[PDB]
């Protein structure tokens, strides 16, 4: 009772996305090697040689050198394959122009993209989602306000916030105020940092000037704006983003400590605060210690961070930021039914690129790899997508319910992860096309774990045995093949099948307060995006509008942000393209180049 | 309630050392030893004097390849100092002096002791070591508890030292910033007495992992070093400090107080023998035969009893008394590890063993590993990190806080000890390299380096009192 | 001592499992390599070549006194002071008849003195030189190395997971194996280095020899680990892999939560 | 011979009367004419710039009319700056990355205070850039794993092997695997991995590109000064991608370069992958035998190695290069001029601690404090007062540099000369008094120059910078004004910490640093300090103050800043004329 | 040990389900282990944080 998989035919486009790779039928286990030319066969490999010539005659040092590899034998001695990006052809929505690019044609597909052109360290909009996290600082302004109308003694209005808000946006990147014989900032560079506000008071948000407003109104459908508004009440929170060039320079730590500054100077001149008055340290106090929300918490000395580095961030932050939820897509990409799959597996492309290629790799370890082909797999060609898809269809089947209604039961959990584990099996068994694609075996074990967690937590609404379901998929996976990842891929995998459901000192905390820092996932690849992306779609299933953080969620449904937050498989895919324009460069004051 | 259940502490050469023993007897918050080998590590410091002198001598302050330079031949270098060449070239000397510091070691020691001391008969000593080249310090209890920080000996000791230098020769200001980098190092630009002279066996109190980790940031190197390699004495010391560290950790408390109290019990303690039996009877072989050697005695001791017979005939095996099934396995593996490593005389293979013990072990029986997931798990993250480009190293840098091997509750690092005992010079990394120092001077603390014995007859004294 | 059952073993494939890893059972020799191609392929040391060292002689160390450590015997390579070689193979995803953990478990239960690692793509076994020689007899000779889908190789060793070759032969990026008059050969050492004379492993199985001797469950030839109707099914009606699999599972799981919630189960 | 903010010694600038048109000694000037902003050629830029992308973006922006109470910025003159000393240079012309040679002597002069601000200027961020992007290792303990565990000879082709490899790795290739990304060379040609050594013929053996070569890049006597220190020993500076830094911390550096030189000795020496020996290789570079630019520092202000507050002070005056250059071995009439060294690494000194760390890292906000700062390195202010002090002493105690007795008297009364000295001509020049209108700019300039000419003429860095803190009475009592609110909290402490012993407050000053507790978080201070350290030293002898292998590491031309020459570096940002590493146009739409 | 008796005692008391556990712990330790402090949680000492 299962439908030709998304792998073979995409839904609507009906792109043969693993064929595609090779010219030959996936199903035939046969290939010739050695037949195509070495890196002659990569567009990006072989432009890299010419350009590493002429870098090599500038500056005096050999740079990339593919006749270096080892015994004389070339890489690309296998066919070097190209990737098509997920879900694509399924998306009808998200067509505006953003920050970053003019409008996508919702159901476009990009296919044919290079290896290299989904690393990390080629791919700014991989970048930019990364920088437009860490650089955002979220507080209350109550307390503030507070402090202005008894110890200062003036009245706060939507005026005065409105004109504090127009002196905060000229001074968070750009200007000064208050002072003669001020340096400042070329706004060319800073024109991606601002600031706004939201609450859950209508009367409010009304009286303020739309420009400076996050409008949950108008971001969220009604029941999602209704919960956010319950948990907001009649509250201002202020979201900030200080500019990509200055976490660029240093690290995401220096946001709560730049809009303290920056804020406290627009209270000082919005509300005509003598220089020096002691109000003035209750701002900065309030924006970095008082009234603070933070996407990341800091780091022991080991990997030391303060706020805001990706090792702080929770997976349930991670869930929250991403903005999929309020997508068409997810509230009726399922024959008109809400769609948590569409959530998880959009959120979890952040959510692995960002923990394993921006933090585990750009900070832990790094080089000049990476590790992208570990962590393409997870949103190319169909695959995670048709297997968790396959969990759900079984389950709606078998318990005769809609998403997030399956019993929450262990018995259901392992009953749902064998029927995942099964047909992600019968899968690469049955096709050597897609066994060679998805060539190492962390790729292969962590799809099944993941697709596993995705259907139990899309089906019970329960996050943290949506998650046991990835750990049970250990023995699963390895009494099958004989074979799991790479070396130390199943250190997290064997350990949580007994932390889960434990509640020693470091070994209990629920899934949506993990995060890069729980001691069993500091170091690996290929899990934790997943976790992010469970989190997201339980939550959604059972008819929540976010998982852990409501302020998070509200603060990240912003236009004005840089990465599209709703669609994160088209924006890495557009970047592929080189068509995504980060924020930060310095172009205004650098050479014609 | 007391762990009342009686059990025999047996020595590393399979002979009763006590019998009858309550397993409250033997746990952190009881047992007097067990509880005066933290009291050691929190209060002892070693001043090596022979550095101090040489960085002041040399101008080879701190770590790093560091030199403050003099220079004693300025009009030799071919360059002018004055315009014109008007008047000739001039050497100073102002980063550097010469301190007979190992010379005045005994009138040293004295001058620190009664810095240190704060009322006679107190406990406070300073011991000459190293035909002067270095002091062996402790505070007394009365100054280390003044507080509630374990650093006291550390930090009084740097500033006692400085001070004592500084009268004593009667140096004048410029000395002040040289001498104190001379016993501090970096301090305060680093937290640490980065490249300083006095050394702690605890690491700086910035380097925890979590709240009470400070008993598990103790590198494997260290502890075989301070046990001079003798196996199951460095599987004691290991053990006995990963159980202070995880009482510290809040971990031995409730439902789990027995679980951890019998890792302790059986795998550091050989408690009834079991490892110096398991070793016994499957040393001549394989890491499989102490999987076969471990089943066996857990069925012969009734903690283990077949459950079902699957139609192959296949049994799974149920646990009669799961905690001590888990200890039972701890103690296994460190067997495994004593007979794979062992056969070899090489400790890499220790990761390894750590791994496939544990799962030999499920396959064989139907039954959960040590740690219930946690002793494949770091057999896995172990492995990967001695043997990868990505961090890590070799088998005896790593301790209880290490990111890598932090997560077994308490029986992961006594069989790194054990392997790395057992190693004939295999590594670069080795106790030599790391810890040469600490096992020279701390060694010689009979309670670090022989702890077996105390913690048995400190046991035999209490036991009455359960 | 007590007699080992290793793992359920129900079917042809985890039978076959039970005897690579049960050292009681002994593996067939199924070809045999001349001295002084067996050193070249391992490419560590040639025939006639003086052992290498990394230590002194173990008599010349100076070991402490330690009961503990007198109970186990130093192996051959252990006395010499042998450095600590490596030797890699790589079984195919494709009917091998041995595969990775099985590898592990097997070194495990038959080789003295070992360190291991198991990866998707590679096993590892590092071990004092000579020691290290003679269990390579065993790699290399038996019934557990199919010349085309159990190969030696150093590095650059992807091909487990690739597709075979028209021969039927797993990839090998630096190409070491070739196949030559219906024989395998080694053109190269496992180091991808130059041979005087190649190598010849001889034949190959056919693919339904192999599937008769693989320790691999595979579904699409018909022997999954979990058949269409066993997810969820009770445990008499499915494999005794996945019964073991869910019974290590709860028990962790229960475990984990209070110690003495698995007492008697 | 007339003061050098008023006469530039040898193209004649006046740099006080280039912001006025007016004599800077007449104490007149009109105010409320100037029109506001209208002045500034960048700030009307920004405004018009600002208006686009208020349309654009849909959200306000840069609006000078904002300023408090209907007065624009501007209601006095918004002064423009020229960069000290550059008409007495006559070397360095050498292209670069970063640019197309320099003409030695030429000036930089009007420069608006925004083109010195470090939010605008690449210079300034790459100079910071490189520090933190570096990574230094000894490798004897790798080549000793090598031939003791693994069994294989380390000989200068495996060296030259290793090296080739590491270069295509470091930044851009694989070499071992199969199927493996790799990135864009476009993106990471800053990136590249070199080596040291004290044994000639072992550097003659090697490829050169790969070599930092000590006896061609300093004089002999400092050459044989770093060579005896590095030894019969190979020390390896590798510098990772500007862009990977720019994405996470300095702290990347030693991780990214344990896992590529880990794998270029795989495949250089062709080890088995998953040999016990790999994990030997990743903790030498790491932990084993590692040199890191900063330490790490504690929770409230976190990070781990690499990060500009953890970097000694003496590790800032030892990456600077002015000690190797002409001008620092034969200005002072063909004597060394150590004043030339001070001056030019309290510029990245003061630049990159105030501006970098403080700013950047600490507080923030548009402003970069560029004024602040800015004062030290332009219009030859402080390099004025510090020659003063210099040349007072030489003729007082008929001796050169470095050679005036490193008593406690000596220093007073140096002190007093030069704060004397620095009061007199703020006294006398009304414009200088408003050019550098901060008290702060003026304090610490007559402490700077005091500690400048103090360490420039006894050799003693700590007494050097006690001379600084001496100045705080000095100062006080002359104006009855300091500087901002919480400028002398480390000038009043000070005074008593320097010859202390107590805990947190002993140290050296070479290894003081941001996080010395009386350092942690005040502008216009350290700099001054890390400019004096390296002008001591350079005045007694020496080739460096702090840590040889530093010093060798940053004599390389393939650096993207020109660690020689950062005042000309800074000015040539501000012509918006420095090409920074780490952009990433190769991946980007067209623009 | 107070949080982690806490905790204990709780999931004893009232006899809770497998479920209950992670919930159950973040009551009393906050965010614990992701953070080094019990952040949110509910076990105070006067004392800072031993990483501060
Ligand atoms: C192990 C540890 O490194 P050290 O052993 O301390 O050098 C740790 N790195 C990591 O966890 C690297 C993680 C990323 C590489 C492995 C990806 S599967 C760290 O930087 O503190
Ligand atoms: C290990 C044992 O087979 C697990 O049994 C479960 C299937 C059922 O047990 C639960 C429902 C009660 O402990
Ligand atoms: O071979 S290892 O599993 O150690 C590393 C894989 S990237
Ligand atoms: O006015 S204050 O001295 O507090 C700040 C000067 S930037
Ligand atoms: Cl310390
Ligand atoms: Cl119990
Ligand atoms: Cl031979
Ligand atoms: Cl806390
Ligand atoms: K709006
Ligand atoms: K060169
Ligand atoms: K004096
Ligand atoms: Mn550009």
New interface residues.
């Given amino acids: 009772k299962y439908p030709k998989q998304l792998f073979l035919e995409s839904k609507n486009s009906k792109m043969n996305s693993i064929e595609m790779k090779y010219g030959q039928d996936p199903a035939i286990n046969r290939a010739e090697f050695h037949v195509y030319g070495g890196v002659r066969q990569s567009k990006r490999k072989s432009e890299a040689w010419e350009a590493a010539k002429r870098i090599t005659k500038e500056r005096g040092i050999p740079n990339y050198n593919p006749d270096l590899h080892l015994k004389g034998a070339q890489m690309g001695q296998k066919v070097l394959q190209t990737y098509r990006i997920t879900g694509l052809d399924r998306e009808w929505a998200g067509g505006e122009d953003t920050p970053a690019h003019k409008g996508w044609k919702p159901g476009t597909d990009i296919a044919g993209l290079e290896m290299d052109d989904l690393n990390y360290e080629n791919n700014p909009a991989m970048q930019q989602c990364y920088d437009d996290m860490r650089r955002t600082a979220i507080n209350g302004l109550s307390i503030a306000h507070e402090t202005i109308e008894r110890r200062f003694g003036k009245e706060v209005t939507p005026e005065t916030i409105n004109l504090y808000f127009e002196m905060l946006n000229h001074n968070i990147g750009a200007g000064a105020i208050m002072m003669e014989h001020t340096a400042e900032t070329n706004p060319e560079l800073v024109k991606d940092s601002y600031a706004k506000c939201f609450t859950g008071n209508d009367e409010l948000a009304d009286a303020l000037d739309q420009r400076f407003l996050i409008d949950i109104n108008k971001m969220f459908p009604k029941y999602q704006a209704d919960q956010i508004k319950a948990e907001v009440g009649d509250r201002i929170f202020q979201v900030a983003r200080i500019p990509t060039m200055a976490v660029r320079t240093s690290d995401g730590g220096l946001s709560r400590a730049w809009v303290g500054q920056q804020a406290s100077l627009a209270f000082l001149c919005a509300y005509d605060i003598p220089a020096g008055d002691a109000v003035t340290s209750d701002f900065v106090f309030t924006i970095k210690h008082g009234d603070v929300v933070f996407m990341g918490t800091q780091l022991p000395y080991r990997r030391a961070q303060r706020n805001n580095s990706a090792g702080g961030i929770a997976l349930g932050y991670y869930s929250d930021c991403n903005q999929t939820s309020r997508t068409p897509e997810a509230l009726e990409g399922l024959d008109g039914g809400i769609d948590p799959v569409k959530v998880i597996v959009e959120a979890l492309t952040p959510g692995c690129v960002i923990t394993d290629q921006g933090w585990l790799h750009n900070y832990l370890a790094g080089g000049s790899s990476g590790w992208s082909n570990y962590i393409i797999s997870v949103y190319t060609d169909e695959v995670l997508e048709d297997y968790g898809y396959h969990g759900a269809i079984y389950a709606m089947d078998k318990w005769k319910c809609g998403v997030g209604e399956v019993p929450n039961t262990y018995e259901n959990m392992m009953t749902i992860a064998e029927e995942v584990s099964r047909w992600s099996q019968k899968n690469y068994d049955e096709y050597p096309g897609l066994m060679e694609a998805h060539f190492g075996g962390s790729q292969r074990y962590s799809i099944q774990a993941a697709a596993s967690g995705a259907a139990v937590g899309a089906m019970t609404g329960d996050p943290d045995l949506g998650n046991a379901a990835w750990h049970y998929n250990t023995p699963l996976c390895k009494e099958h093949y004989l074979r799991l990842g790479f070396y130390g891929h199943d250190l997290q995998d064997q350990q949580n099948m007994g932390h889960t459901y434990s509640y020693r000192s470091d070994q209990g905390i629920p899934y949506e307060l993990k995060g890069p820092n729980y001691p069993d996932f500091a170091m690996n690849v290929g899990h934790m995006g997943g976790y992010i992306g469970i989190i997201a779609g339980a939550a959604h299933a059972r008819g929540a509008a976010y998982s852990t953080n409501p302020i998070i969620k509200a603060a990240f449904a912003d236009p004005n942000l840089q990465f599209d937050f709703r669609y994160p498989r088209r924006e890495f895919g557009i970047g592929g393209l080189r068509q995504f324009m980060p924020a930060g460069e310095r172009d205004a004051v650098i050479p014609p180049h | 309630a007391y762990l009342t259940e009686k059990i025999d502490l047996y020595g590393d050469n399979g002979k009763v050392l006590e019998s009858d023993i309550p397993l409250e007897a033997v746990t952190p918050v009881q047992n007097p030893a067990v509880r005066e080998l933290a009291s050691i590590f929190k209060r002892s410091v070693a001043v090596n004097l022979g550095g101090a002198q040489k960085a002041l001598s040399t101008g080879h302050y701190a770590n790093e390849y560091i030199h403050f330079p003099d220079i004693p031949n300025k009009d030799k270098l071919g360059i002018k100092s004055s315009p014109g060449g008007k008047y000739p070239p001039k050497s100073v000397k102002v980063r550097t002096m010469d301190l007979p510091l190992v010379d005045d070691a005994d009138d040293i020691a004295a001058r620190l002791k009664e810095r240190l001391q704060v009322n006679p008969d107190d406990g406070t000593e300073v011991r000459v070591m190293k035909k002067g080249n270095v002091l062996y310090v402790k505070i007394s209890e009365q100054l280390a508890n003044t507080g509630v920080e374990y650093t006291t000996a550390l930090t009084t000791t740097a500033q006692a030292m400085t001070d004592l230098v500084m009268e004593k020769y009667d140096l004048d200001f410029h000395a002040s910033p040289l001498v104190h980098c001379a016993f501090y190092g970096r301090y305060p630009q680093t937290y640490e007495f980065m490249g300083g002279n006095v050394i702690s066996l605890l690491a700086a109190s910035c380097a925890n992992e979590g709240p009470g980790f400070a008993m598990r940031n103790i590198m494997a190197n260290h502890i075989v070093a301070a046990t001079r390699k003798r196996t199951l004495e460095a599987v004691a010391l290991s053990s006995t400090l990963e159980a202070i560290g995880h009482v510290e950790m809040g971990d031995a408390i409730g439902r789990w107080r027995r679980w951890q109290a019998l890792v302790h019990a059986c795998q550091g303690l050989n408690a009834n023998n079991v490892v110096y039996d398991l070793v016994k009877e499957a040393g001549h072989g394989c890491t499989g035969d102490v999987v076969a050697a471990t089943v066996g005695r857990a069925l012969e001791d009734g903690i283990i009893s077949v459950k079902k017979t699957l139609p192959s005939g296949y049994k799974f095996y149920t646990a009669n008394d799961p905690s001590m099934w888990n200890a039972y396995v701890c103690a296994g593996l460190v067997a495994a590890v004593i007979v794979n490593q062992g056969a070899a005389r090489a400790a890499q293979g220790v990761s390894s063993t750590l791994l496939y013990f544990n799962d030999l072990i499920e396959h064989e029986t139907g039954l959960p590993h040590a740690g219930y997931g946690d002793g494949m798990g770091n057999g896995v993250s172990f492995s990967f990190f001695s043997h990868a480009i990505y961090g890590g190293g070799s088998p005896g840098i790593f301790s209880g806080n290490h990111i890598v091997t932090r997560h077994s509750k308490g029986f992961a690092i006594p069989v790194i000890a054990a392997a790395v005992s057992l190693d004939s010079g295999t590594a670069v990394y080795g106790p030599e390299a790391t810890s040469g120092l600490v096992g020279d001077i701390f060694g010689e603390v009979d309670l670090i380096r022989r702890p077996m014995e105390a913690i048995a007859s400190a046991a035999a004294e209490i036991k009455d009192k359960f | ?10 079917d042809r494939v985890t039978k076959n ?1 039970k005897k690579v890893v049960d ?1 009681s059972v002994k593996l067939e020799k199924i070809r045999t390599l001349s001295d002084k191609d067996f050193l070249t392929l391992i490419g560590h040391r040639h025939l006639g070549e003086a052992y ?1 060292s ?3 002689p ?1 008599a010349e ?1 100076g ?7 007198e ?5 051959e ?2 006395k010499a ?1 042998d ?2 070689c ?3 193979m790589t079984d195919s ?2 009917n091998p008849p041995i ?4 590898r ?2 097997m070194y ?15 096993v ?1 076994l ?3 030189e000579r ?1 290290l020689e003679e269990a390579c007899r065993t790699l290399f000779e038996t019934e557990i190395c199919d010349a085309s889908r159990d190969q030696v190789r ?5 091909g ?7 021969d039927g032969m797993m ?1 090998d ?3 070491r194996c070739i196949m030559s008059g219906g024989n395998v050969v080694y053109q ?1 050492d496992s ?3 130059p041979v005087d004379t190649p190598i010849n492993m001889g034949k190959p199985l056919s693919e339904e020899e192999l599937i008769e001797r693989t ?6 030839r018909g022997e ?5 109707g ?3 099914a009770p445990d008499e009606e499915v494999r ?26």
Avoid at chain 3, 154 to 158: D, G, L, P, R, S
């Fill in positions: 001592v007590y007699q080992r059952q290793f793992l359920p073993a129900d499992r050292p290498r990394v230590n002194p173990l160390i070991e402490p006194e330690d009961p503990i450590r109970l186990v015997p130093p192996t390579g252990a002071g450095r600590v490596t030797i890699i995803v494709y595969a990775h953990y099985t592990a478990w495990h239960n038959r080789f003295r003195g070992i360190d291991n690692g198991v990866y998707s793509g590679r590892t590092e071990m004092r020691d150093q590095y650059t060793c992807t487990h997971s690739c597709r075979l070759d028209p990839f990026p630096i190409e190269k180091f991808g280095n320790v691999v469950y595979r579904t699409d999954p680990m979990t058949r269409e066993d997810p969820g005794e892999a996945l019964q073991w699999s869910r019974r290590i599972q709860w028990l962790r799981m229960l475990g984990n939560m209070v110690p003495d919630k698995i007492k008697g189960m």
